[PDB]
């Protein structure tokens, strides 16, 4: 199955519904846990079985261990490769904010998209995936900010 | 039952629109995977 960015679809609701987005790289499919809940996936005629997942990180990988290990450099602009339901993939460039936590700081992107955009990759200037979009907060003025959520390789 | 469909290459786009703020926020992450503002 080809490297790239993928829509995660279900037929269980009304019509065809996009519940999320993911990344195929090095033979492993990467998405957020709340998108699939760890359920298996179909890719054409083939089946993708969950391999690793963690609810607290809100991540899951299929067919193998988590492969994405690039990280935001804390300084440069990044691009969100947003794949909204029913709409063409689009790159949005932005300078990340920061989630400060008791266990360290991670990048965050203040961009709002439909729920089924969950799992869209965030990219550095070399095209490496530095994390996935869609686990975040709503701040005082009502705007959505997503963590740049990255796994461990 | 869920299935996947390719949507593109993972590639930096030279002429991308630039938008969005860079807020610095104190947050907490709970065992359920939910972020909250501290």
């Amino acid at each position: 199955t080809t490297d790239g960015v993928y829509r995660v679809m279900t037929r269980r609701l009304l019509g065809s519904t996009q519940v999320g987005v993911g990344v195929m790289q090095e033979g492993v499919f990467h998405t957020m846990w709340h998108v699939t809940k760890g359920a298996a996936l179909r890719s054409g005629e083939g089946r993708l079985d969950p391999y690793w997942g963690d609810v607290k990180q809100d991540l899951v990988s299929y067919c193998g261990p988590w492969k994405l290990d690039a990280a935001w450099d804390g300084l440069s602009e990044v691009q969100l490769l947003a794949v909204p339901p029913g709409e063409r993939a689009k790159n949005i460039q932005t300078l990340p904010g920061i989630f400060k936590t008791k266990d360290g700081d991670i990048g965050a992107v203040a961009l709002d998209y439909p729920a089924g955009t969950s799992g869209s990759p965030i990219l550095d200037k070399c095209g490496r995936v530095i994390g996935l979009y869609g686990n975040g907060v709503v701040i005082k003025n009502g705007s959505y900010v997503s963590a740049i959520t990255q796994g461990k390789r | 039952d869920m299935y996947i469909e390719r949507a593109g290459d993972i590639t930096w786009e030279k002429d991308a629109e630039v938008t969005g703020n860079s807020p610095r926020l104190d947050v907490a992450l709970d065992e359920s995977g939910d972020f909250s503002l501290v």
Binding site: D112, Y113, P114, A115, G134 | F35
Partner: peptide, 7 residues
């Protein structure tokens, strides 16, 4: 975050 809330 639409109807996803935080998600």
């Amino acid at each position: 975050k639409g109807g996803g809330x935080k998600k």
